[PDB]
Amino acid sequence: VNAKQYXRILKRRXARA
Amino acid sequence: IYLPIANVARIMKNAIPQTGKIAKDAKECVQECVSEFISFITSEASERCHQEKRKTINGEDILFAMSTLGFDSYVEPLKLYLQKFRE
Amino acid sequence: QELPLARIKKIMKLDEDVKMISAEAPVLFAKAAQIFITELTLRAWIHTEDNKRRTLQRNDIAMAITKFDQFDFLIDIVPR
Secondary structure, eight states, X not given: OOTXXXXXXXXXXXXXX | OOOOHHHHHHHHHHHSOTTOEEOXXXXXXXXXXXXXXXXXXXXXXXXXHHHXXXXXXXXXXXXXXXXXXXXXXXXXXXXXXXXXXXX | OOOOHHHHHHXXXXXXXXXXXXXXXXXHHHHHXXXXXXXXXXXXXXXXXXXXXXXXXXXXXHHHHTTXXXXXXXXXXXXX
16 A cells, blocks of 8 residues: 555545445 | 536646547546545545534645645645645 | 646645645645656556557556556556
């Protein structure tokens, strides 16, 4: 993964739900 | 929820050969991508402003989030752009 | 050649964690968006040309997103 982005990607994914 | 299709399209147009073409669904795609970019960076900034118990996301916060998230290349041009504002 | 701040601000306000936004923040996003669109578009065009077309297609953007780790955040937005 993109270490710098991965946390935020998953947080964004969770949010879209 | 999206930036104007016309504005998106103009910026895309300037990036390709003068005789290149762009499908409408490609433009829409870019609209969606741009909104996610803004929301992605904004989310990072909003979390860190809340944790620090600050109520306002400022320009510096956006710049820091961009740095944090690997958009390091954006920071200097954005600083220069903002300085040119403000002047 | 400069974007609408009002729309940028509205997009920011979608996020329920966001409270107040300083005046300059949308300005920064206006420039950032232009940089981003330029780079995303250039990268999509690669796949356009590789496919021997002169028309940039959604498929080219999806493909470009998988080739650049900076675009990982879009993988969900533009399914390959």
